[PDB]
Amino acid sequence: EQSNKQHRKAKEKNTAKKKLHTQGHNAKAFAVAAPGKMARTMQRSSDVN
Amino acid sequence: GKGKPRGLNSARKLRVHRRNNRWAENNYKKRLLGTAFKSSPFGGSSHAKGIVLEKLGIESKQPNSAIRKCVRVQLIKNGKKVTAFVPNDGCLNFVDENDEVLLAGFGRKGKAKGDIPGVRFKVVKVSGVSLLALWKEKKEKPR
RNA sequence: GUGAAAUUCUUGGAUUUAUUGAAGACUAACUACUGCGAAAGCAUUUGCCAAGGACGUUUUCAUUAAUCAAGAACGAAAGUUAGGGGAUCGAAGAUGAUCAGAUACCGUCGUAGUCUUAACCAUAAACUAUGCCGACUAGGGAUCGGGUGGUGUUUUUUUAAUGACCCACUCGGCACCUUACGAGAAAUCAAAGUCUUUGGGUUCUGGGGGAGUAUGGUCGCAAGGCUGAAAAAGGAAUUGA
RNA sequence: GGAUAGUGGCCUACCAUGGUUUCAACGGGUAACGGGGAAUAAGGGUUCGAUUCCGGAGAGGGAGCCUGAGAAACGGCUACCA
Numbered sequence: 001e002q003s004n005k006q007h008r009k010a011k012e013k014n015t016a017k018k019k020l021h022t023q024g025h026n027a028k029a030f031a032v033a034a035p036g037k038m039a040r041t042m043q044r045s046s047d048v049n
Numbered sequence: 050g051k052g053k054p055r056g057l058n059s060a061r062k063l064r065v066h067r068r069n070n071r072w073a074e075n076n077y078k079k080r081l082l083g084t085a086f087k088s089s090p091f092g093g094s095s096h097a098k099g100i101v102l103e104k105l106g107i108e109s110k111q112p113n114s115a116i117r118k119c120v121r122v123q124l125i126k127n128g129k130k131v132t133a134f135v136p137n138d139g140c141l142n143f144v145d146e147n148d149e150v151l152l153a154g155f156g157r158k159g160k161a162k163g164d165i166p167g168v169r170f171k172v173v174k175v176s177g178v179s180l181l182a183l184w185k186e187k188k189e190k191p192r
Numbered sequence: 193g194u195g196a197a198a199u200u201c202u203u204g205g206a207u208u209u210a211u212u213g214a215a216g217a218c219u220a221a222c223u224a225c226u227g228c229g230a231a232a233g234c235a236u237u238u239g240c241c242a243a244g245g246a247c248g249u250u251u252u253c254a255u256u257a258a259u260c261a262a263g264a265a266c267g268a269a270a271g272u273u274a275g276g277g278g279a280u281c282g283a284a285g286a287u288g289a290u291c292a293g294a295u296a297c298c299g300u301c302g303u304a305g306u307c308u309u310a311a312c313c314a315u316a317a318a319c320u321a322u323g324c325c326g327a328c329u330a331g332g333g334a335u336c337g338g339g340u341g342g343u344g345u346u347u348u349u350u351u352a353a354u355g356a357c358c359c360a361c362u363c364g365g366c367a368c369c370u371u372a373c374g375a376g377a378a379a380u381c382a383a384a385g386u387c388u389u390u391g392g393g394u395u396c397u398g399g400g401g402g403a404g405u406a407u408g409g410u411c412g413c414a415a416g417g418c419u420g421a422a423a424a425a426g427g428a429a430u431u432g433a
Numbered sequence: 434g435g436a437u438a439g440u441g442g443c444c445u446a447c448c449a450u451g452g453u454u455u456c457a458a459c460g461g462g463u464a465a466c467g468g469g470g471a472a473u474a475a476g477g478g479u480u481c482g483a484u485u486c487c488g489g490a491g492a493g494g495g496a497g498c499c500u501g502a503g504a505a506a507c508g509g510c511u512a513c514c515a
Contacts (some may be wrong), residue, residue, distance in 0.1 A: 014398095015398085017069075030463095032462080034464070055393080
């Protein structure tokens with residue numbers, strides 16, 4: 001009997017970079033300037049709602 | 050030489066390269082975009098608010114089984130039905146119908162003998178007062 | 193011609209034999225763990241045109257260098273457009289035999305292609321499954337190119353060559369055999385090493401498998417618009433009653 | 434030249450055709466007032482700083498002016514939107 005090892009070819013889509021750019025706008029650009037403050041204010045505001 | 054530059058003037062490259070790869074991270078991207086709380090159990094909040102639809106297991110026989118402790122409430126900021134624990138079938142009595150319960154996470158640490166899995170919420174306040182308060186007879190449920 | 197056959201061609205003599213002729217490819221044995229090239233690739237002879245590595249050098253300039261996006265050059269086979277030629281093999285196709293067994297699934301003919309010029313295409317298990325430049329860190333032979341030396345055979349001697357072999361040394365190659373005081377999960381690796389946790393220069397890149405699901409994350413692709421039927425031993429049987 | 438407390442494309446004439454940019458200009462985002470400071474990690478860094486002091490800007494939103502040494506003031510005025 002023969003054992004013919006197979007080989008992988010190439011990647012299709014496993015990249016955080018292209019995943020960011022895959023929507024029309026630049027999700028990287030449309031961001032904030034104070035992530036921690038966003039986090040705590042969204043916490044507080046969701047609770048009040 | 051480890052792949053990155055090293056010369057004493059290459060700070061522009063070290064900085065810019067770090068910025069792009071820092072984006073390639075995952076906790077970082079979510080933190081800057083504002084989506085960790087779209088992953089969270091029920092939105093931003095720490096407690097949610099719901100309406101008791103119906104008490105399941107009213108007709109079960111052995112008292113204080115999980116299917117007795119369970120109810121079914123619809124979260125009001127979605128109109129979305131989810132089931133939820135309540136300790137103490139007595140407290141099952143304290144919560145009846147159209148009650149505006151305040152739900153919290155369950156956060157169980159270890160399973161029990163017959164615990165229903167897939168039931169992640171617990172009732173904390175009912176019609177505005179605390180279940181433990183009612184149960185301990187400190188307060189009284191105001192209709 | 194196959195495992196077996198069969199279409200087919202053959203008294204106007206086929207297959208075979210002898211002597212020739214033409215046509216287009218192709219370059220056997222010699223062919224090697226040998227050579228050349230940036231890779232793809234490249235084997236008949238002689239000539240011309242330039243080009244190249246290595247080696248030799250008590251020649252010359254004197255930092256002119258390394259890594260590098262864009263772009264460019266070239267890029268097997270197949271393929272496309274337009275011409276040319278068209279022996280051979282030959283996707284599609286047309287056909288024969290469909291005989292058990294496929295253990296022994298093919299035969300005859302053949303468009304396009306194969307070949308060539310001028311343009312496109314730019315992909316391969318294009319592989320040494322591993323970015324480049326520099327330096328150091330183990331022994332051993334062989335082999336190809338160049339040079340130096342030694343020694344005798346092969347050679348020859350006032351004409352035109354003065355090359356072959358053997359030996360030591362030597363730069364530079366294609367690879368090989370032993371091992372690593374090293375590395376690694378292991379196979380293995382002369383780099384995939386460079387004394388416990390880390391800085392010789394530089395570019396690009398990163399944050400398994402099947403399944404089960406949600407899709408507003410999105411792109412494609414559909415139809416018809418006169419048209420219809422009503423239970424059985426009332427068996428089996430050269431084997432039965 | 435006009436204007437101003439005064440410099441200056443500040444504005445107006447008339448001239449040249451320049452200025453910034455892979456050493457990232459221009460544009461977009463900002464749950465961006467800036468700093469002293471606060472938290473914390475062994476260092477390196479990271480995150481917070483509306484908030485007792487310093488600076489800036491604002492008084493529902495555009496614009497405009499009067500007094501006065503000092504205001505484009507709003508517990509002053511005028512009109513416009515709400």
